[PDB]
Write a protein that binds this DNA or RNA. Sequence first.
DNA 1: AGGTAGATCCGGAC
DNA 2: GTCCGGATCTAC
Length: 252
Amino acid sequence: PELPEVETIRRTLLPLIVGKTIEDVRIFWPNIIRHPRDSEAFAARMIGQTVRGLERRGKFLKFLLDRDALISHLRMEGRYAVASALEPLEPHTHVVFCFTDGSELRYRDVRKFGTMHVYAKEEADRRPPLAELGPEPLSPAFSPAVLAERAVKTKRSVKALLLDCTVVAGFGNIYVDESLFRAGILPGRPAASLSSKEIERLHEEMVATIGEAVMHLYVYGRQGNPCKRCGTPIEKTVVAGRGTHYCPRCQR
DNA sequence: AGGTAGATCCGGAC
DNA sequence: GTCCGGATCTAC
Ligand SMILES: [Zn+2]
């Protein structure tokens, strides 16, 4: 799920788990657990804690319990569901939190690619994976000045910069390509080559693109098809190690 | 020093 | 057999 989808999950999951107390934690693929390194320690420490809140930082969900925060990343295909302990689990379920009320919060992922870290609440923000995470793209902390400061300092392309989680939190491949299209900027441009005007426009489009989604595609996945704005066929290349889509007329 | 590329994890689709 | 997302860890 992309950032807007993580926000929807955050909003919808909260009322379904708040105030429930963990009675067991069952782990079917231990590699999902990244901290504590022992998945037995992970399961043991959560028992007896009640869910108090649910926050989002980039694409991370932060489950707030009594003493601990559980930091979860779903990557592309991870999903959470709340359901009865009496009913069979869905395929690819890797972690289940059992509540004292007979309900369960289940984590499933065909790709088996997500991560979970648990730390004392007060430590979560200064440890992996949240440590060093850049500002929320919809917050005033993400400003053109901040984007411009990072851009001038680097030899990397503008796409590489935007994909950097220390620059801006959880701006995925799809939103990078769409925002660069809307800003009229080629994804392979050196970030240091952007004018003040271009940086301002890019920040504007980034906020608008994410903002609209949190609250429909021009280029992503549309290679070989006409640009919706000018009719030029959309092209795909590799930039920053990623599938990268652009209109060669609209973007420069 | 520290910026930045490369390796790493996974499995459905090609 | 190779490819590919995100984000972190390793090493140039
Ligand atoms: Zn175009």
